[model samples]
Target: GLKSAYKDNFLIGAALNATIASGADERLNTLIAKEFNSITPENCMKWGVLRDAQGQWNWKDADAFVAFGTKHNLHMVGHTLVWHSQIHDEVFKNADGSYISKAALQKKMEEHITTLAGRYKGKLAAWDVVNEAVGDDLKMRDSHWYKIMGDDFIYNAFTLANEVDPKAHLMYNDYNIERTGKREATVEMIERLQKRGMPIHGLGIQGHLGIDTPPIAEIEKSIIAFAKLGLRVHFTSLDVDVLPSVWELPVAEVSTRFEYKPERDPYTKGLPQEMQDKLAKRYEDLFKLFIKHSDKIDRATFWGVSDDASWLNGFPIPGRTNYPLLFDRKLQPKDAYFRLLDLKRLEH
Candidate 1:
């Protein structure tokens, strides 16, 4: 439904885990093929699962993911070639636990990108070549990659990805990039890459948002700013968390942790009609903004196919129910889904 509704504006996409990609969930697989025109592997393509040791690789799920997308003729995206989280220890350390030399690290990083990116060169439309390299303080994150290779790792990722797949768009993906400080910092980093003649093509603004945290205008400002840099803007992992915040500010940091509390898990029974309406309105406002800037935005992808599949369920608070996606747990379209379709119809 979304693919047809937004066909003229931009691509509609969803992240698929291995189960859905492999057709283990028939209903989800059918819904995905009919609704979305693009797909991103939610976890299969990450370093931790894809490669655990030197010359030891896991390709079953990743291969199924690509094959599913290819069969559907969808725009495929390799979630990441480099990330600090979900990475194997062997990537940066020896069996004895000593840090690998800088050259050794660079060689490992390049080879990983080459092998992965080279395998699906012509099939994927884009790759999140580097993910979350910028920190919350508006500076390059001091990830292990940074500590070992400095900022050159990010540059090398884009360069090597381009060399491996000349046609696939190379992107730097991150979350909380809508905030003023983070957004400006990301722009500056892209500008630096451009100055160095790196082959960076786009920015994946992971839209892991809350119902009320980021004002719509802030997201609009970010779209305008990133577009000014002549880079295609993609709302990579879009979802609206309907739960109460554990922190003072909204955060999408995967490493963030919190103790589970009964009060925080209020939505266990089911989302109230009022909350459902709010979620619908939130999605409506987001799509209105996206449609208005379709020229600059290339894709708007949900982090999961349905509410139950969202990573928000166990994130920040484990076992908490979060109604964060367009489809409900039963695979039925929610109010948010109709709201998006309505927005497009009203435009005509």
Candidate 2:
């Protein structure tokens, strides 16, 4: 439905995990095929899952993921080639347990990017070449890659990925970049990469948003800013968290976690009608903004197909029930879905 609704605007995509990619859930796969025109591997393409150990690669899950995209003739996106989290510690450590030298780490990064990006060179339409390299503090995150290779790690990654797959668009993906400090920092980072002549083509603003946080004006400003830089803009991981925040600022850091609290886990039975309306309105506002910027925005991807599959279900506050997607747990379209389709009619 979304694919057809937004066909004139941009690609509508959904993130898929191994289970859905394998067609283990027929209903879910059918829903995905119908609603989305693009597919992003949710976790299978991450370093930890893709590479079990040094010199050893796991293709079983990643292959099926790509195969599913091909079978559906969907635009495939490789989630990431380099990320600080969900990666093995051995990636930075030598057999002697010492931190690998900058040269060694660069070599490892090149090999990993070449082998993986090269494998699906033509199949994937784009790759999140580097993910979350900027921190909330408006500074380069002190990830192992940064510590070992300094900021050059980001440059190295984009360069290597481009060399491997010249046809695929390369992107730098991060969360909270819609905010002032983070947005400015990300723009500067992209500018620096461009100055160095890196093959960076886009910026992925991970949309792990709240029901009310991040005013629409701020998101619009970001889209305009990034587009002015002549880079494609993608809302890579779009979702709306319906729960109250445990932190003062809305954050989407994968490592940020809070202990389970009963109060935080409201809507355990099911989302109330009012909250469901709020969720639908939130999605409506977002899609409207996205549609307005269709020329500058290339793709809008939900992080998951349905509420039950959303990473927000357990993130930040584990064991919490979150209604963050357009589809309910049963794979039925919610008010958000109809509202999106209705946009076409209203426009016509």
Candidate 3:
């Protein structure tokens, strides 16, 4: 099990998609139970699904997820406590399409963060208190959260979450944080919040990466930079897609393509052995880097369990099969998985 292999390093984890959470596939569930010590729900815990138009809470699946993780003694992660990108308008507007007042929004934020984090306070390992608020342009994304609440909400969101669960590790998670401008913006945000004495405990770099993009040196630099902030770096969503199939669309706009054409997915049959070797090398190099900075990293989570279960398929292009994970379609370890284990074995 990866948990045993990296027990001394960081926790080895996988994202538990809705299917695995509700009792969908027996094999997937068995695999999850056997391997990972940590788990993050892919969608259920996000803001879009947790609340409704009438402002009623949907605790159905989230409840199941918490119970499952608790029963297994897994280190569970609440994907995001507050994210402007993943939130539903139900959180901001009324039924007649009237906008919520700024004060009302702040109150809603307090309610949202406290209620959600309060429920899972001591149950989970950490909460991604805020996600993707900073964008690639080195500025906070002009979403509704930023529009009404301004940048102050970033500090307050973490503040409220800590108020709810003072012991919980509150994290600020984002993608493309490896980029210089964005990285600087994130640092500024953290520093600004630090001045206010907010409880920003962790920094999660959503390593939605590929085998080739953003050379290893760049990744190391970003990790070190975050570590210097005194933040526990968590490598969230570590995947290795060879190419980008999905566009950076609004969260509501991004959905699975229903009709998948054979030509849409180039490597559905299987990838060439040379490409597999490239992936293995990437994984080995990445694991070595993670091992090198093991003290700074808290937990490194693979986005999904198997290639067959990967959300990258039917993404921007339907039927795309980028082998971006350790396990393949049949729940067997890929060569890359062995490379990971081999690196760990050599450590002792």
Candidate 4:
């Protein structure tokens, strides 16, 4: 049954990008089909999951995902359109191996964006049209597209997304976009474009925070700042990354369940149980803030479907371990999950 507490929420979502695969178990599948008001299949729709090879698009998984979402009438959100990293192969290339030109890439992006966006316009309310486009130091990463197309690539994405589906909301999504400094400047980019009448719709500040790293106050400021820009605030790609030992750090040799590692992990371990407690409390506290600032925040989405599926497995560097999610392997609520859902009264 629909929980009463969530009735006031704009969109209560979860990251089930793996539902079409990893999360297809019948029991949990029923909950997903019945409970969640919306879903984002993590980033599975991006380069790796979609156009794995040039001119090759896999819509089997993505289409079933959308069909399931549509059957539930859930509010859907797509991950991204242009990220320097996601595009694995290219339809057109230069003699030197660089992208042929912005025109070519832009056209490719338009085709990808229009195909999916047009296919599910009314159903998908928003899209993280661009993601992780910012570096921790507050500058755009020198990604392949960014290098060849310049800053105009961002604008071009928003424009084409608009042409694809005028009804769907679009956003410039990135991590660490909180209070003063470089993050603020990134928001300013949106403001400048909007000032010129660019059809900017939302700001997706990824909650890619550590156990207690991003102070709640900064997150609050992030919400208000983007709200003032008249753009909806979506806490996209959010998760609290926690270390293993209280002080035990990971190195080039630390064993993990998967590939990639966390960069924030101290070469020496940081806090362990304390970090987990802090992480859980932070999720609850911040979600409380989300409820309070419900007026400004439009959507809040977790990054992974579950801990087992989290990219944190080996990210940043190898060997670093991460436990940053709401559920354990059995799909039961972790302390963080109960805390968050209880705060929203979804579990009560």
Candidate 5:
């Protein structure tokens, strides 16, 4: 962090994938307490993590997280209230696992949001009322949520959050909202909802960027596009990991000299220095966009604090070489540390 950082203009949250109290990254909470404003328990609060087997809520880690964030006066943005992923599919789906009544699924869906929102009423500022609902073509993603609950499931969750805690901001979050027809659909969603006066308050743009090649203009354009919708844009799941394998291109196994060895603790295969500098440029560019539109973007958060724990390592070929985050394997800042803090200098 710099002497005068964007601490004031920024919501400055970090995404925590697991519990730091369990010694995952012991200094992480302190690091966030020092640098960021709030923290999103990326997985700790997700359905798979909290209600692992359903009907049982293990707030053990989630409770600890909310407590720590509360002590720091951070506006704990509940990661989510509803999703079809990893559920028993019984309460939310049909006996044959095909379809369930929209009304039935929505009632159960409403229970999750209302109960969670009601329980944490005043503390939470907003929630990802729903996440990743749209498919690649910009149509509502037909996940199990869609199969049983239908697209109305999204509407139900957002409506319930508002009913329980009118003060809380309700957001629809998804990846790829920054490009293609995804951006178009997102804007259309906000416009239609706003016209009808739905309480949908924000949009979460998952910046799941790959290494070095995303056109900077498209990224910048995406921010402005969301801003026009009166939606607060968040650079969520922000990462730029470099691996031997390049996305949008195939890796050459003949050139594959490196191998992933999990027994070695990190289970990592390091990238060349060229890859590191390229990643540096990506963060520098994206942060520059954030600084350019600081008035529109509400938060700038790294998906996870460190690389060793990232889901990227499990992506493509699990346990393979990957580096899609702002921090290194050491839980410390990489070039992102300097660029994020350095940009404030230009403001001076």
Candidate 6:
């Protein structure tokens, strides 16, 4: 249902837990099977479990995840191939407790990237080849990877990922990339890789968002910025808060075509009508921007299956309701859902 609505424009996706030892969650499983055409494993495919305790690797959960995606015929994305977080501590050291040489570690990274991304081969439609390498100062992080392999590691990772599986799409996924400085830094890296002809196909904006944080202007600016590089803009995480206090509306407007009549006045709605209107406008404007850049923006993904499943439920402040997704606790589509579908119809 969701995929059909946006099929001509871009993909509609959601993340799912791969460790649900039961293979899948029984309750919300039906909507996932019916609605989304793309899938991202929440954590299973990250470097943490895939490369365990130095040389060991356990792909039980990851394999199960791939099987589930293949069984359902979904467009699967490998969550990440390399990241500063969730990586096994032992990966930084050698088997003999001695510090690994820079070249030695680079060899290991090449091996790991080749093995991890290579295993899936053509199976995955895309891979978040690298995640969150930028530091607050808009430079690459001082993580162990950087300490050892340095800047060249970025290109090295992309080069190896391409060598392993030339057909699978590759992307650089990061958080707060909507911020001007961070976004500029991310693009700087991508441009360098592009000059080298590295195969980075997409840019993931990890929108661990609220009712209103990323200014709509900044969001649209980001889409246009990355698109100019001919990179597909993927909204990696989406969640909203209902009834949250507004920071400031600023009477913001982006030049997108949609006539307000008695028929489409959904707010007529952000976080809660002044609040819910903010949320509605956020969704409506984002989709409008996506439509305008339909050739540039390729995929959009929600972080969870339903509002009840959203991490916002107990995050930052505990025991508060955060209506951040397209589906309700009952797995029914929300008003925002209909409005997005409504915008998709406007495409023609």
The candidate scoring highest on lDDT is 1
Candidate 3's C-alpha runs over 4 A off are: 94-98, 244-264
**Worst ten in a row by lDDT for model 2:** 248-257
Separately for all candidates shown, the number of backbone clashes (residues 3 or more apart, or on different chains) is 0, 0, 0, 12, 3, 13
User: Tell me, what's the RMSD of every candidate?
Assistant: 2.6, 2.6, 3.6, 4.7, 3.9, 8.2
Model 5 spans > 4 angstroms off = 2-4, 21-26, 52-54, 244-269
Candidates' lDDT values, in order?
0.91, 0.89, 0.84, 0.70, 0.71, 0.76
Error of 1 at 306 (Å): 0.4
TM-score of 3: 0.92
> What lDDT score goes with residue 57 in model 6?
81
Report the lDDT tens digits of candidate 6 across residue range 57-160: 88888888888888889898888887878886577766575567778878888888888887889888898888889997888888888887787777788888
CA deviation > 4 Å runs, candidate 2: 95-97, 249-257
Which pairs clash inside model 5? 133-141, 241-323, 241-324
**Tens-place lDDT digits, model 4, residues 1-348:** 222345576566677755543545777666555445667866667765677665677787777777767776777888777776656645446656756777887777778778877777877788777777766667777777777777777877788789888988998887768756756778767777787677778988878777656788888888888899898888777777775332244565455423343444553342355655777798888888888888888777777656666776556545564667776655555677667666665434
lDDT of 5 by residue, 203-264 (tens): 88888876654667888888898888888888767777565443344356433323444532
Candidate 1 stretches greater than 4 Å from native: 53-55, 95-97, 249-257
Better of 1 and 6 by lDDT: 1
Q: What's the candidate order when arranged by decreasing lDDT?
A: 1, 2, 3, 6, 5, 4
lDDT of 1 at 114: 89
Residue 342 error for model 2, in Å? 1.2
